RNA sequence: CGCGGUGCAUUAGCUAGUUGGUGAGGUAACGGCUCACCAAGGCCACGAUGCAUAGCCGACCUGAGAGGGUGAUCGGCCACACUGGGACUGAGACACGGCCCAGACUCCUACGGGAGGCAGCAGUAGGGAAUCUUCGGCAAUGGACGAAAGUCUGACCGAGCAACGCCGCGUGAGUGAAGAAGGUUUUCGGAUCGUAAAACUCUGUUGUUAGAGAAGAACAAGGACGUUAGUAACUGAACGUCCCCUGACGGUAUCUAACCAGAAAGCCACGGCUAACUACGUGCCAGCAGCCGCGGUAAUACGUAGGUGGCAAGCGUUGUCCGGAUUUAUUGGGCGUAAAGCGAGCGCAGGCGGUUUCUUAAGUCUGAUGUGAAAGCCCCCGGCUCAACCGGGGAGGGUCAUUGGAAACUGGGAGACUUGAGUGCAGAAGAGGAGAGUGGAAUUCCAUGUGUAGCGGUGAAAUGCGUAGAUAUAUGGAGGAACACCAGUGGCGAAGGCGGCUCUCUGGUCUGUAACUGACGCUGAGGCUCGAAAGCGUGGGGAGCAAACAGGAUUAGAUACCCUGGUAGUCCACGCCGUAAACGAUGAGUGCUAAGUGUUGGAGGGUUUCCGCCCUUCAGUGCUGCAGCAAACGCAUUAAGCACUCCGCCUGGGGAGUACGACCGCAAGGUUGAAACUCAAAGGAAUUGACGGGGGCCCGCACAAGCGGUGGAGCAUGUGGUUUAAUUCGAAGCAACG
RNA sequence: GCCUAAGGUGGGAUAGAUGAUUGGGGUGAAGUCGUAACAAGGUAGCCGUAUCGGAAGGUGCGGCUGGAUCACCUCCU
RNA sequence: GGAGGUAUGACAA
């Protein structure tokens, strides 16, 4: 059954990017509206509207893409999983890419991203890494 | 493999033995067992003094010893150099080393050590093979 | 007391003062620490117990790191002091240079009895590849005793021995030839060793000779005075200031002067890897070698020489560890065909798990404090002429504790939810299973007519059957096994598997609906169940087929293929076995990611008089084919794609699926499962050729259709062989032999 | 007198050595017998099992294609 | 066209 929601939201997003797919849906989750919000204002996605449903709601995102249709996501990796959850300290919190890309890091201030989290100077679970 | 399955029977390794697994071994004559002492080499005498064939692809009469070392046990090794003294129960000194034609030999015999004397008109390389400067 | 740091279940059971209690006693002290009683517990797959190994740590080596390896010297802790046991004394020992007893060993006896313990510093023997002087001093520092002088201190300071290691400096510097002699080598011109040498001018680190001479010492004691507290007053105590007093090292470092380049370099490598190449000598020999490989008479690979390269008081070899090795992959690999998916299910524990409100805060994150000794690496900073080395000041290091915070995520608690999962209701298909019956076709046998010499079989034959009447043909009877057509990458089942028909019992799946439950789920080591064929046991059956076996052939031989027979077995019941290229050679669950076209079972709608067609859709089953993936082959919504969860499994080939042990089995065997030793390959896919008793298409006096020959005779001629003083040498399948 | 080291006796457990003899295995520049596999390898091969044979192997039963060649229907380009 | 099903031969060179 399916045990990573998250780990599910990413490769549904991989998938169809891989395809250039316009929009893609996914069943809602505070933590995947978190991550969808980060995706969104760090521009790489291009939007994101929510549908309010009977079972748990659904997120509808709209995939980007450049002149030429580049990808501006290129991939994207479940760090913490089920089976091995990733804590990082304040001092430990990666880099993706040199900063080129994003980690999406859950911490007691909230889902928010590597910049964020080691200028409030705090730790948290790597949920993913975004580039 | 999982995560859980590594936590549950983890990761081993292979391990390695030696190439020349007669030298580390120690005998203690007292208790009569054998000592897992490394040692870079070992005296013995030689039992045979002899000659050998090689292997298909080479074709020679190859000079070794059998040799039954200070920790008793029976070696093959072999007699680098052109020309040497050794005879049956003469005292020489073995090192590590295979030679790759002989199956059987694992050893070579030290040159200008204990017994053995080094090699008769040796010019270059004369450490090896045991043999002072001219 | 929490936590942390080895291997083996081919070690799962262990425990009986053992677990707890009640008292008593005992200890510095709590306590089964001991005891008497009363219970019976304690431990253990989160690895008890047993076995093997090991002092532990700070640290050290390695590595990009994660890690791996090690535990010398220095420091901390522990343990032990001939082996075993005991207590005494003492604040402290069950006490290395104490006692007692026992034991093994050495030694002394007057035989009655006595003595001894270097794993203290040296040293000896022995073992070993292999580790030091039976040295000086207590001056320094520290320790014991004393009021002190002081005595004692193999601690410790020194010195000696070893290139054992690290660091520093040398073994000279400058000028110096179109380039001497000599070596090596030449294409004989010249090259090269070589500015190297020589020569000339310099230098003294060193070396030698003389001389000059440290710090390390602070002291204590003692001789003077002084200040505090106390005292009637004192001597003295505590403190302060002056004088005095001591060097093992040792005439050591160091410095200065004179004198001479004079006494002071080797080792390995040079086929590729790998920096460095030529001559001889040798000719699968002698030898080399880490791997690949060198050597078979023109070897940069063997040995020597000249050159050259690397490093240098060292250089190489061997041994050991880390690296390279992603080659156990947490970081950081895999399992269709290369090693690797258990034959399949059901499931305990365990691992993982949908949405959401509040809450908690164990995990997680964060602040502060405590602590993580010193030395060491690292960072600054100083000292030794530099460095090694030394000193000072930091930093680092914990899955540390205590405490204050945060609260997204995981977890816990109280709710809510309906999508996953299941129930209800309504339907659909099916060789799903079990039991009991039953049908026709055919084979065989049997009986009876008809009928007459064959039948049967092979490449060809024979064995065999038949005139005791065959085979064939007709009519019947018996019995066993299998189910033509239907029939289909069709159906059903977890897999193995399931095919005539009928009934009885029975499992599962699929589609609608959305009434009900409200995460009840997924996976699943160990266990359990099922599991083709062969085989096994007991009792039946036995038509056909057919291991074995017999006979006939084939053949050089045939223990085969072929033929004629034929037993077990194949069938049934019951109980075993538990293995298969048990295969999709592809574990299960879930979600996502172009299309096209068949087909099986459903559902919904739009047309069609119905029949059916059109479209939408669910679940199977196939084919084709993007993206992506792949070593390639290929896979591709029935993934081998993109992801998450759990399980199984893999780590070069051989030895081995073997041995030993264990469990299981009536047995056959199965399950678990090594090592020595050995090789430098084994392997996957694809490529170009060659080949095939593969296929297709063609050609040539290739065959066929012909004519005339050779092989027989004599002789000529060449060859072989033999012979010979010589019968000269060469040619030998076609393609040597007038 | 209790405890108790050592010693003695007893039956087991466990580890190494050694042993007439015996078993398969590996190795060995040029031995004997056959020719089982690789081509349709001349009887397609292989898997499990049984049975037989000097030996490779043969044969039966079921299974697999990791099957050469010619001949079909479905499928699909 | 493509797909699942029906006797012997040394060794080195
Ligand atoms: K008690
Ligand atoms: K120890
Ligand atoms: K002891
Ligand atoms: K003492
Ligand atoms: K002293
Ligand atoms: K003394
Ligand atoms: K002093
Ligand atoms: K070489
Ligand atoms: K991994
Ligand atoms: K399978
Ligand atoms: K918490
Ligand atoms: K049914
Ligand atoms: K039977
Ligand atoms: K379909
Ligand atoms: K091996
Ligand atoms: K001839
Ligand atoms: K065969
Ligand atoms: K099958
Ligand atoms: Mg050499
Ligand atoms: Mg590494
Ligand atoms: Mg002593
Ligand atoms: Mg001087
Ligand atoms: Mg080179
Ligand atoms: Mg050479
Ligand atoms: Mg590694
Ligand atoms: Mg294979
Ligand atoms: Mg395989
Ligand atoms: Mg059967
Ligand atoms: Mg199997
Ligand atoms: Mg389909
Ligand atoms: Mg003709
Ligand atoms: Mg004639
Ligand atoms: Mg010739
Ligand atoms: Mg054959
Ligand atoms: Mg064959
Ligand atoms: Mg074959
Ligand atoms: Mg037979």
Redesign the pocket.
Known sequence: ????????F???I???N??K?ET?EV????????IAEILKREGFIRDVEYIED????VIRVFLKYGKNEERVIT?L??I??????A??????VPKVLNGLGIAII??????ITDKEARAK?????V?AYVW | ?????????????????????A??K????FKKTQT?????????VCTRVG?M???????????YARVR???LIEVTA?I?????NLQEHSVV?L??????????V?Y?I?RGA?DTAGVN?????????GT???
Request: charged content about 30%; aromatic content about 2%.
């Open positions: 059954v399916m045990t990573d929601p998250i780990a599910d990413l490769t549904r991989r998938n169809a891989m395809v797919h893609l069943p809602a989750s505070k933590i995947k509206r978190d009977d079972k748990q709601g991939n990796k479940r913490s999983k089920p089976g091995l959850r804590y990082v300290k304040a001092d430990e859950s911490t007691s201030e909230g889902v100077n705090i730790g948290g679970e949920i | 493999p999982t995560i859980n399955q590594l936590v549950r029977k983890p990761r081993k390794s292979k391990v390695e033995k030696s190439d020349s697994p030298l580390n120690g005998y203690n004559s897992n002492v490394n040692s870079p080499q070992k005296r013995g000659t064939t090689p292997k298909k692809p080479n074709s020679a009469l190859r000079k070392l200070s920790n072999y680098p150099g052109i020309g040497h000194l090192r590590g080393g295979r030679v790759k034609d002989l199956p059987g694992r070579h030290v204990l008109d040796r010019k270059q390389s004369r450490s090896k093979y002072k400067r001219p």
